[PDB]
Ligand binder design. Structure first.
Ligand code: 625
Length: 365
């Protein structure tokens, strides 16, 4: 039942959302980061200072070694592991068990987060970006292939409303209508590697940034639950900040705040910060729809930090964006739906919105 999947996500603010999963036989309980921005099922499988729990293959009667290694560097650090398969369940997702690939992380540099309370990552994106390569079938592909679970999942990330605790839901195999109000709007998945989408227009408080839309998707825009911030290409970030500074000129903040480095505290003038509208390409060529997020989303609690940051790898619509909405990763129809979340945080003057269509008279990069 979808009812039993509601609120199956937890996390700490800025440290991601995780779902409880079991691996192996007997079931080994682990908390797993729900990550639409990667495609590996990778779980700590060796002691680590930040890990209080980890996957123990030798305890699993159903573990099978793939006698294949996997190495994953990424500037900041890395993770390295040994590939195998084992039985996997999501106790509060579908009532099914799946033999999925597992990267048992045996060593990692700056991968695990201190106090996040998750022990692995569930990469929900496509095989194309899986490590070591696209032959390593991602978890969700195995799930759909092995079970009758419909090729669709939906994320309701609720945020907050010690680091603040966040809740949410991952509904696998369907759409839970009680999770959103109003209309579900779909934007095409441009390509099945990341959950790549097209942003055709953005405005800060109704004011168009007036950029060639290729700038919004340079070199790509993705929907990524494994990123906390709204990340924007340099040129768009600067214009966004400039425009947000202007609209909130009353009250001045250190540029260290706009840089997302330091917090700023009251004991909050929301109305001073503008709403941000992302226009996503519609299923119909020249149509688009906007998702409008409040400062309650792009100012996350710490006291808040500016949760909009610069990117050199294109737009990242992270949790900051997703927390306003019910997001449907309709993989069967290669599209992503956005609807106002039943849980999104808003005051008595503004509210996160999903509105369309908007029509125009080439945005992919
Ligand atoms: N939310 C939030 C905030 C908490 C951040 O939590 C984390 C903790 C760790 C990682 C991570 C380290 C290395 C990889 C990786 C790199 C390449 C291939 C496969 C993988 Cl697994 N990842 C996955 C990854 C990276 C970058 C973006 C996305 N979306 N996912 C990500 C987020």
């Amino acid at each position: 039942s979808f009812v039993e999947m509601v609120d199956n996500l937890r996390g700490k603010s800025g440290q991601g959302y995780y779902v409880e999963m079991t691996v192996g036989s007997p079931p080994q309980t682990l908390n797993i980061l729900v990550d639409t921005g990667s495609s590996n099922f990778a779980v700590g499988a060796a002691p680590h200072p930040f890990l209080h729990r980890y996957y123990q293959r030798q305890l699993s009667s159903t573990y099978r070694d793939l006698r294949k290694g996997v190495y994953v560097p990424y500037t900041q650090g890395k993770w390295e592991g040994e590939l195998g398969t084992d039985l996997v369940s999501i106790p509060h997702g579908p009532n099914v068990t799946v033999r999925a690939n597992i990267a048992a992380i045996t060593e990692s540099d700056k991968f695990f987060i201190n106090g996040s309370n998750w022990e692995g990552i569930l990469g929900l994106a496509y095989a194309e970006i899986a490590r070591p390569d696209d032959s390593l079938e991602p978890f969700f592909d195995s799930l759909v292939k092995q079970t009758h679970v419909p090729n669709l999942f939906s994320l309701q990330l609720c945020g907050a409303g010690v680091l603040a605790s966040v809740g949410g839901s991952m509904i696998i195999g369907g759409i839970d209508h009680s999770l959103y109000t109003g209309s579900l709007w779909y934007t095409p998945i441009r390509r099945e590697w990341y959950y790549e989408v097209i942003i055709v227009r953005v405005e800060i408080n109704g004011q168009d940034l007036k950029m060639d839309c290729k700038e919004y998707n340079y070199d790509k825009s993705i929907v990524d639950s494994g990123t906390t911030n709204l990340r924007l290409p340099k040129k768009v970030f600067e214009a966004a900040v400039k425009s947000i500074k202007a609209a909130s000129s009353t009250e001045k903040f250190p540029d260290g705040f706009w840089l997302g480095e330091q917090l700023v505290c009251w004991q909050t003038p929301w109305n001073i910060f503008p709403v941000i509208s992302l226009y996503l390409m519609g299923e119909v060529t020249n149509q688009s729809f906007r998702i409008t997020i409040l400062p309650q989303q792009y100012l996350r609690p710490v006291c808040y930090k500016f949760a909009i940051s610069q990117s050199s790898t294109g737009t990242v619509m992270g949790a900051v964006i997703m927390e306003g909405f019910y997001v449907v990763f309709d993989r069967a129809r290669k599209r992503i739906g956005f609807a106002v979340s039943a849980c999104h945080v808003h005051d008595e003057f503004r509210t996160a919105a999903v509105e369309g269509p908007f029509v125009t008279l080439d945005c992919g990069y």
